[PDB]
Design a protein around this ligand. Structure first.
Ligand SMILES: *[C@@H]1O[C@H](CO)[C@@H](O)[C@H](O)[C@H]1NC(C)=O
Lengths: 203, 212
Protein backbone atom coordinates (compact mmCIF):
# COMPACT_ATOMS: atom_id res chain seq x y z
CA UNK A 1 0.00 0.00 0.00
CA UNK A 2 2.00 2.83 -1.50
CA UNK A 3 3.12 6.11 0.05
CA UNK A 4 5.76 8.69 -0.81
CA UNK A 5 7.97 10.85 1.41
CA UNK A 6 8.35 13.73 1.64
CA UNK A 7 5.83 16.05 -0.02
CA UNK A 8 8.30 18.93 -0.60
CA UNK A 9 12.08 19.11 -1.00
CA UNK A 10 14.37 22.10 -1.37
CA UNK A 11 18.00 21.47 -2.20
CA UNK A 12 21.10 23.34 -3.18
CA UNK A 13 22.75 22.88 -6.60
CA UNK A 14 25.46 20.20 -6.29
CA UNK A 15 23.75 18.50 -3.37
CA UNK A 16 22.17 15.05 -3.22
CA UNK A 17 18.50 14.34 -2.59
CA UNK A 18 16.64 11.13 -1.85
CA UNK A 19 12.94 10.38 -2.34
CA UNK A 20 11.25 7.28 -0.88
CA UNK A 21 8.17 5.21 -1.78
CA UNK A 22 6.67 2.33 0.13
CA UNK A 23 5.38 -0.20 -2.36
CA UNK A 24 5.46 -3.67 -3.98
CA UNK A 25 6.14 -4.87 -7.52
CA UNK A 26 7.70 -3.53 -10.70
CA UNK A 27 8.15 0.14 -9.81
CA UNK A 28 9.02 3.13 -11.97
CA UNK A 29 10.08 6.70 -11.17
CA UNK A 30 9.11 9.69 -13.29
CA UNK A 31 10.06 13.34 -13.49
CA UNK A 32 7.35 15.82 -14.35
CA UNK A 33 7.88 19.49 -15.12
CA UNK A 34 5.24 21.75 -13.92
CA UNK A 35 3.24 22.13 -17.12
CA UNK A 36 4.51 19.07 -18.98
CA UNK A 37 4.35 15.30 -19.58
CA UNK A 38 6.16 12.82 -17.34
CA UNK A 39 9.63 11.58 -18.22
CA UNK A 40 10.84 8.09 -17.28
CA UNK A 41 13.91 8.16 -15.00
CA UNK A 42 14.09 4.64 -13.58
CA UNK A 43 12.28 1.47 -14.44
CA UNK A 44 11.96 -1.70 -12.41
CA UNK A 45 13.41 -0.33 -9.22
CA UNK A 46 16.90 0.57 -10.29
CA UNK A 47 17.34 0.34 -14.04
CA UNK A 48 18.32 3.72 -15.42
CA UNK A 49 16.36 4.69 -18.47
CA UNK A 50 18.42 5.16 -21.66
CA UNK A 51 19.40 8.79 -22.10
CA UNK A 52 19.14 9.84 -18.47
CA UNK A 53 22.18 11.07 -16.57
CA UNK A 54 23.79 8.50 -14.31
CA UNK A 55 23.42 10.98 -11.48
CA UNK A 56 19.94 9.39 -11.21
CA UNK A 57 19.64 5.94 -9.56
CA UNK A 58 17.27 3.72 -7.66
CA UNK A 59 17.54 1.22 -4.81
CA UNK A 60 14.98 -1.37 -3.75
CA UNK A 61 15.15 -2.96 -0.35
CA UNK A 62 12.00 -4.84 0.60
CA UNK A 63 9.07 -2.47 0.30
CA UNK A 64 11.30 0.60 0.25
CA UNK A 65 12.28 2.20 -3.04
CA UNK A 66 14.67 5.14 -3.00
CA UNK A 67 15.18 7.40 -5.94
CA UNK A 68 18.45 9.29 -5.55
CA UNK A 69 19.65 12.37 -7.45
CA UNK A 70 23.30 13.16 -6.96
CA UNK A 71 24.90 16.43 -7.82
CA UNK A 72 21.57 18.09 -8.17
CA UNK A 73 21.24 20.44 -11.16
CA UNK A 74 18.90 23.45 -12.00
CA UNK A 75 17.02 21.37 -14.56
CA UNK A 76 16.13 18.84 -11.81
CA UNK A 77 13.47 21.16 -10.44
CA UNK A 78 10.22 19.25 -10.87
CA UNK A 79 7.85 16.80 -9.25
CA UNK A 80 8.95 13.21 -8.89
CA UNK A 81 6.72 10.16 -8.49
CA UNK A 82 6.70 6.37 -8.31
CA UNK A 83 4.22 4.13 -10.09
CA UNK A 84 3.21 0.50 -9.90
CA UNK A 85 0.77 -0.61 -12.57
CA UNK A 86 -2.28 1.67 -12.21
CA UNK A 87 -1.21 3.34 -9.01
CA UNK A 88 0.70 6.61 -9.10
CA UNK A 89 1.66 8.40 -5.92
CA UNK A 90 0.85 12.16 -5.85
CA UNK A 91 4.55 12.96 -5.57
CA UNK A 92 7.25 15.29 -4.25
CA UNK A 93 7.92 18.86 -5.41
CA UNK A 94 11.67 19.59 -5.61
CA UNK A 95 12.78 23.21 -5.70
CA UNK A 96 16.18 24.91 -5.68
CA UNK A 97 17.20 26.33 -2.32
CA UNK A 98 18.34 29.93 -1.98
CA UNK A 99 18.77 32.42 0.82
CA UNK A 100 15.56 33.17 2.65
CA UNK A 101 13.69 36.18 1.28
CA UNK A 102 10.70 38.01 2.76
CA UNK A 103 7.89 39.04 0.37
CA UNK A 104 7.89 42.50 -1.12
CA UNK A 105 4.28 43.26 -0.15
CA UNK A 106 1.76 45.52 -1.92
CA UNK A 107 -1.96 46.22 -2.16
CA UNK A 108 -4.16 47.49 -4.97
CA UNK A 109 -7.47 49.28 -4.40
CA UNK A 110 -10.25 48.65 -6.91
CA UNK A 111 -9.99 50.58 -10.20
CA UNK A 112 -12.83 53.04 -10.59
CA UNK A 113 -13.20 51.99 -14.23
CA UNK A 114 -14.21 48.63 -12.72
CA UNK A 115 -16.54 49.80 -9.94
CA UNK A 116 -18.64 50.99 -12.90
CA UNK A 117 -19.29 47.27 -13.44
CA UNK A 118 -20.67 46.67 -9.95
CA UNK A 119 -17.93 44.24 -8.92
CA UNK A 120 -14.94 45.43 -6.90
CA UNK A 121 -11.59 43.54 -6.80
CA UNK A 122 -8.90 44.17 -4.17
CA UNK A 123 -5.52 42.67 -4.97
CA UNK A 124 -2.52 41.66 -2.87
CA UNK A 125 0.96 41.01 -4.22
CA UNK A 126 3.73 39.15 -2.42
CA UNK A 127 6.81 39.51 -4.52
CA UNK A 128 9.99 37.50 -4.78
CA UNK A 129 10.01 35.48 -1.56
CA UNK A 130 11.59 32.17 -0.49
CA UNK A 131 10.82 29.50 0.54
CA UNK A 132 7.45 29.22 -1.12
CA UNK A 133 5.07 28.53 1.78
CA UNK A 134 3.06 31.61 2.68
CA UNK A 135 -0.13 32.94 4.27
CA UNK A 136 -2.11 35.97 3.07
CA UNK A 137 -4.71 37.58 5.32
CA UNK A 138 -7.40 39.94 4.07
CA UNK A 139 -8.56 42.47 6.66
CA UNK A 140 -10.97 45.40 6.29
CA UNK A 141 -11.81 47.54 9.31
CA UNK A 142 -10.26 44.64 11.25
CA UNK A 143 -13.02 42.35 10.01
CA UNK A 144 -11.59 39.00 8.96
CA UNK A 145 -12.92 37.84 5.61
CA UNK A 146 -13.22 34.09 5.42
CA UNK A 147 -14.78 33.42 2.05
CA UNK A 148 -14.39 35.48 -1.17
CA UNK A 149 -10.63 35.05 -1.94
CA UNK A 150 -8.52 33.69 -4.81
CA UNK A 151 -4.81 32.84 -4.70
CA UNK A 152 -2.30 32.19 -7.46
CA UNK A 153 1.44 31.53 -7.20
CA UNK A 154 4.23 31.55 -9.79
CA UNK A 155 6.62 28.67 -10.52
CA UNK A 156 10.08 29.06 -9.00
CA UNK A 157 11.74 31.81 -10.94
CA UNK A 158 14.47 30.57 -13.30
CA UNK A 159 16.71 33.49 -12.36
CA UNK A 160 16.44 34.55 -8.76
CA UNK A 161 14.87 31.32 -7.49
CA UNK A 162 11.95 33.15 -5.83
CA UNK A 163 8.23 32.79 -5.90
CA UNK A 164 5.47 35.36 -6.09
CA UNK A 165 1.85 35.19 -5.04
CA UNK A 166 -1.26 37.12 -5.98
CA UNK A 167 -4.47 37.03 -3.92
CA UNK A 168 -7.72 38.53 -5.23
CA UNK A 169 -10.40 39.62 -2.77
CA UNK A 170 -13.51 40.10 -4.96
CA UNK A 171 -16.53 41.89 -3.38
CA UNK A 172 -19.64 43.72 -4.70
CA UNK A 173 -19.96 47.47 -5.38
CA UNK A 174 -22.05 48.35 -2.32
CA UNK A 175 -20.46 46.50 0.59
CA UNK A 176 -17.12 47.96 -0.55
CA UNK A 177 -17.88 51.67 -0.10
CA UNK A 178 -19.23 51.04 3.42
CA UNK A 179 -15.87 50.40 5.00
CA UNK A 180 -12.68 52.42 5.27
CA UNK A 181 -9.44 50.60 6.07
CA UNK A 182 -8.30 47.84 3.75
CA UNK A 183 -5.20 46.02 4.93
CA UNK A 184 -3.26 43.05 3.56
CA UNK A 185 -1.45 41.07 6.28
CA UNK A 186 0.92 38.27 5.26
CA UNK A 187 2.99 35.83 7.32
CA UNK A 188 6.14 34.25 5.83
CA UNK A 189 9.16 32.38 7.14
CA UNK A 190 11.62 35.10 6.22
CA UNK A 191 9.57 37.73 8.03
CA UNK A 192 10.32 38.37 11.72
CA UNK A 193 6.75 39.59 12.23
CA UNK A 194 3.62 39.37 10.08
CA UNK A 195 3.60 42.72 8.28
CA UNK A 196 0.77 44.67 6.69
CA UNK A 197 0.26 47.11 3.87
CA UNK A 198 -3.02 48.97 4.43
CA UNK A 199 -4.94 51.63 2.48
CA UNK A 200 -8.12 53.75 2.70
CA UNK A 201 -9.52 57.01 1.33
CA UNK A 202 -6.89 59.75 1.29
CA UNK A 203 -5.14 59.18 -2.06
CA UNK B 1 8.75 6.58 -31.36
CA UNK B 2 6.30 9.41 -30.90
CA UNK B 3 2.83 10.46 -29.65
CA UNK B 4 1.07 13.69 -30.56
CA UNK B 5 -2.21 14.63 -28.94
CA UNK B 6 -5.03 16.88 -30.11
CA UNK B 7 -5.42 20.49 -28.99
CA UNK B 8 -7.28 21.84 -25.96
CA UNK B 9 -10.99 21.22 -25.85
CA UNK B 10 -13.84 23.07 -24.17
CA UNK B 11 -17.34 21.68 -23.82
CA UNK B 12 -20.63 22.37 -22.08
CA UNK B 13 -21.68 19.99 -19.27
CA UNK B 14 -23.66 16.96 -20.45
CA UNK B 15 -21.94 16.85 -23.86
CA UNK B 16 -19.31 14.54 -25.34
CA UNK B 17 -15.67 15.27 -25.98
CA UNK B 18 -13.06 13.40 -27.97
CA UNK B 19 -9.30 13.45 -27.34
CA UNK B 20 -7.00 12.09 -30.04
CA UNK B 21 -3.53 10.62 -29.88
CA UNK B 22 -1.55 10.06 -33.06
CA UNK B 23 1.13 7.38 -32.74
CA UNK B 24 3.97 6.76 -35.14
CA UNK B 25 7.52 5.47 -35.23
CA UNK B 26 7.62 1.77 -34.34
CA UNK B 27 5.84 -1.55 -34.20
CA UNK B 28 2.70 0.10 -32.82
CA UNK B 29 0.71 -3.16 -32.77
CA UNK B 30 3.17 -4.39 -30.19
CA UNK B 31 2.34 -2.01 -27.40
CA UNK B 32 -0.70 -1.13 -25.40
CA UNK B 33 -1.70 2.48 -25.29
CA UNK B 34 -2.81 3.77 -21.94
CA UNK B 35 -4.71 6.92 -21.05
CA UNK B 36 -4.08 8.92 -17.90
CA UNK B 37 -5.67 12.03 -16.53
CA UNK B 38 -4.42 14.77 -14.24
CA UNK B 39 -6.69 17.16 -12.38
CA UNK B 40 -5.27 20.60 -11.48
CA UNK B 41 -2.64 20.40 -8.75
CA UNK B 42 -3.12 16.64 -8.39
CA UNK B 43 -1.56 13.28 -9.15
CA UNK B 44 -2.15 11.12 -12.20
CA UNK B 45 -5.10 8.73 -12.32
CA UNK B 46 -5.33 5.71 -14.58
CA UNK B 47 -8.08 5.92 -17.15
CA UNK B 48 -7.62 2.76 -19.18
CA UNK B 49 -5.76 0.76 -21.80
CA UNK B 50 -6.48 -0.31 -25.34
CA UNK B 51 -4.86 -3.00 -27.49
CA UNK B 52 -3.89 -1.58 -30.90
CA UNK B 53 -4.01 -5.00 -32.58
CA UNK B 54 -7.60 -5.88 -31.60
CA UNK B 55 -9.11 -2.58 -30.44
CA UNK B 56 -9.93 -4.25 -27.13
CA UNK B 57 -10.13 -1.71 -24.26
CA UNK B 58 -9.56 -2.82 -20.65
CA UNK B 59 -13.19 -2.70 -19.45
CA UNK B 60 -15.74 -4.59 -21.59
CA UNK B 61 -19.00 -2.69 -22.30
CA UNK B 62 -20.60 -3.87 -19.02
CA UNK B 63 -17.89 -1.91 -17.16
CA UNK B 64 -16.81 0.93 -19.47
CA UNK B 65 -19.21 3.58 -18.13
CA UNK B 66 -18.73 7.10 -19.50
CA UNK B 67 -15.39 6.52 -21.22
CA UNK B 68 -14.76 4.64 -24.46
CA UNK B 69 -11.32 3.91 -25.92
CA UNK B 70 -10.99 3.31 -29.64
CA UNK B 71 -8.34 2.95 -32.33
CA UNK B 72 -8.26 3.31 -36.05
CA UNK B 73 -5.38 1.72 -37.87
CA UNK B 74 -3.66 3.78 -40.55
CA UNK B 75 -3.47 0.68 -42.74
CA UNK B 76 0.21 1.14 -43.66
CA UNK B 77 0.59 0.43 -39.91
CA UNK B 78 3.17 3.22 -39.70
CA UNK B 79 0.41 5.31 -38.10
CA UNK B 80 -2.41 4.82 -35.63
CA UNK B 81 -4.94 7.22 -34.16
CA UNK B 82 -6.24 6.50 -30.65
CA UNK B 83 -9.39 8.09 -29.26
CA UNK B 84 -10.74 8.77 -25.82
CA UNK B 85 -14.41 9.51 -25.95
CA UNK B 86 -16.01 10.98 -22.86
CA UNK B 87 -19.78 11.15 -22.81
CA UNK B 88 -22.11 13.16 -20.53
CA UNK B 89 -19.21 15.24 -19.31
CA UNK B 90 -19.15 17.09 -16.02
CA UNK B 91 -16.88 19.44 -14.09
CA UNK B 92 -15.12 16.36 -12.57
CA UNK B 93 -13.73 15.52 -16.00
CA UNK B 94 -11.81 18.82 -16.21
CA UNK B 95 -8.14 17.82 -16.43
CA UNK B 96 -5.16 17.15 -18.63
CA UNK B 97 -5.43 13.86 -20.53
CA UNK B 98 -2.25 12.00 -21.54
CA UNK B 99 -1.83 9.03 -23.83
CA UNK B 100 1.26 6.97 -23.11
CA UNK B 101 3.03 3.87 -24.36
CA UNK B 102 3.43 0.70 -22.28
CA UNK B 103 6.87 -0.58 -23.13
CA UNK B 104 7.19 -3.88 -21.29
CA UNK B 105 4.51 -6.21 -19.96
CA UNK B 106 5.14 -4.40 -16.68
CA UNK B 107 3.78 -0.89 -17.27
CA UNK B 108 6.93 1.24 -17.69
CA UNK B 109 5.73 4.22 -19.67
CA UNK B 110 8.64 5.51 -21.77
CA UNK B 111 6.71 7.77 -24.17
CA UNK B 112 4.00 10.29 -23.30
CA UNK B 113 1.78 12.55 -25.32
CA UNK B 114 2.08 16.23 -24.49
CA UNK B 115 -1.38 16.20 -22.97
CA UNK B 116 -4.78 17.65 -23.80
CA UNK B 117 -6.68 20.07 -21.56
CA UNK B 118 -10.36 19.29 -21.29
CA UNK B 119 -12.28 22.10 -19.70
CA UNK B 120 -15.92 21.45 -18.89
CA UNK B 121 -17.66 24.69 -17.99
CA UNK B 122 -21.24 25.92 -17.93
CA UNK B 123 -20.25 29.06 -19.85
CA UNK B 124 -19.02 29.98 -23.36
CA UNK B 125 -16.70 32.44 -25.16
CA UNK B 126 -16.10 35.91 -23.69
CA UNK B 127 -13.26 38.34 -24.22
CA UNK B 128 -11.73 39.62 -20.96
CA UNK B 129 -11.92 43.04 -19.44
CA UNK B 130 -8.78 44.80 -18.22
CA UNK B 131 -8.44 47.13 -15.23
CA UNK B 132 -5.25 48.86 -14.11
CA UNK B 133 -3.26 48.19 -10.93
CA UNK B 134 -1.96 51.64 -9.97
CA UNK B 135 0.83 52.34 -7.40
CA UNK B 136 11.08 50.67 -6.10
CA UNK B 137 7.29 50.20 -6.45
CA UNK B 138 4.77 47.88 -8.20
CA UNK B 139 2.12 48.23 -10.94
CA UNK B 140 -0.11 45.89 -12.93
CA UNK B 141 -3.21 44.83 -14.82
CA UNK B 142 -6.12 42.70 -13.70
CA UNK B 143 -7.40 40.67 -16.64
CA UNK B 144 -10.91 39.79 -15.51
CA UNK B 145 -13.88 37.68 -16.63
CA UNK B 146 -12.72 35.94 -19.78
CA UNK B 147 -13.21 32.51 -21.26
CA UNK B 148 -11.88 30.35 -22.17
CA UNK B 149 -8.22 30.29 -21.22
CA UNK B 150 -5.71 31.43 -22.37
CA UNK B 151 -4.69 35.07 -22.61
CA UNK B 152 -1.29 36.56 -23.35
CA UNK B 153 0.00 39.62 -21.57
CA UNK B 154 2.95 41.74 -22.61
CA UNK B 155 4.11 45.17 -21.45
CA UNK B 156 5.15 47.90 -23.87
CA UNK B 157 4.58 45.46 -26.73
CA UNK B 158 7.28 43.12 -25.44
CA UNK B 159 9.84 45.84 -24.72
CA UNK B 160 9.46 45.35 -20.98
CA UNK B 161 10.15 41.85 -19.64
CA UNK B 162 12.20 42.38 -16.48
CA UNK B 163 10.30 42.39 -13.20
CA UNK B 164 7.23 41.06 -14.97
CA UNK B 165 5.21 38.34 -13.25
CA UNK B 166 2.18 37.07 -15.12
CA UNK B 167 0.31 34.81 -12.68
CA UNK B 168 -1.69 31.66 -13.34
CA UNK B 169 -5.34 32.39 -13.94
CA UNK B 170 -7.68 31.51 -11.09
CA UNK B 171 -11.29 30.58 -11.53
CA UNK B 172 -14.28 32.29 -9.98
CA UNK B 173 -17.75 31.14 -8.89
CA UNK B 174 -18.71 33.31 -11.82
CA UNK B 175 -17.39 30.34 -13.81
CA UNK B 176 -14.96 32.67 -15.63
CA UNK B 177 -11.22 33.23 -15.18
CA UNK B 178 -9.25 36.10 -13.71
CA UNK B 179 -5.48 36.60 -13.85
CA UNK B 180 -3.18 39.47 -13.05
CA UNK B 181 0.09 40.61 -14.61
CA UNK B 182 2.58 42.71 -12.65
CA UNK B 183 5.88 44.59 -12.96
CA UNK B 184 8.15 46.19 -10.42
CA UNK B 185 10.16 49.31 -11.16
CA UNK B 186 12.16 51.86 -9.12
CA UNK B 187 9.98 54.49 -7.34
CA UNK B 188 11.23 56.90 -10.02
CA UNK B 189 10.89 56.40 -13.79
CA UNK B 190 7.07 56.64 -13.34
CA UNK B 191 6.27 60.06 -14.78
CA UNK B 192 9.07 59.18 -17.22
CA UNK B 193 7.72 55.89 -18.57
CA UNK B 194 4.51 54.93 -20.36
CA UNK B 195 3.29 51.63 -18.94
CA UNK B 196 1.01 49.73 -21.25
CA UNK B 197 -0.05 46.12 -20.92
CA UNK B 198 -1.23 44.55 -24.16
CA UNK B 199 -3.63 41.73 -23.57
CA UNK B 200 -4.79 39.17 -26.10
CA UNK B 201 -7.56 36.59 -26.10
CA UNK B 202 -7.49 34.66 -29.38
CA UNK B 203 -10.83 32.78 -28.96
CA UNK B 204 -12.65 36.14 -29.14
CA UNK B 205 -10.44 38.34 -31.35
CA UNK B 206 -10.20 40.57 -28.29
CA UNK B 207 -7.00 42.61 -28.13
CA UNK B 208 -7.11 45.48 -25.66
CA UNK B 209 -4.07 47.60 -24.76
CA UNK B 210 -4.36 49.43 -21.40
CA UNK B 211 -2.16 51.97 -19.61
CA UNK B 212 -1.34 52.67 -15.95
C1 LIG C 1 16.75 5.33 1.40
O1 LIG C 1 17.43 6.40 1.94
C2 LIG C 1 17.27 6.47 3.29
C3 LIG C 1 17.76 7.89 3.65
O2 LIG C 1 18.80 8.17 2.73
C4 LIG C 1 18.19 5.41 3.90
O3 LIG C 1 18.03 5.33 5.28
C5 LIG C 1 17.88 3.99 3.32
O4 LIG C 1 19.03 3.21 3.41
C6 LIG C 1 17.54 4.01 1.77
N1 LIG C 1 16.66 2.90 1.36
C7 LIG C 1 17.08 1.94 0.39
C8 LIG C 1 16.03 0.90 0.05
O5 LIG C 1 18.19 1.96 -0.12
Amino acid sequence: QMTQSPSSLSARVGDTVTITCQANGYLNWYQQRRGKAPKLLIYDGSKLERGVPARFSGRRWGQEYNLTINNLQPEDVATYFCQVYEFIVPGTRLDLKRTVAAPSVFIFPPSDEQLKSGTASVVCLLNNFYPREAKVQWKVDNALQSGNSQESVTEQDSKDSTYSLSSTLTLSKADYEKHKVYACEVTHQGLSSPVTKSFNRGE
Amino acid sequence: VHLSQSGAAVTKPGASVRVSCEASGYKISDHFIHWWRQAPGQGLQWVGWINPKTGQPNNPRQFQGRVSLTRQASWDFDTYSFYMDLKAVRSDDTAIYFCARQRSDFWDFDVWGSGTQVTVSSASTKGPSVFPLAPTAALGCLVKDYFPEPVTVSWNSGALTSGVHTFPAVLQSSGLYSLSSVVTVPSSSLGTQTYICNVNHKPSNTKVDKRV
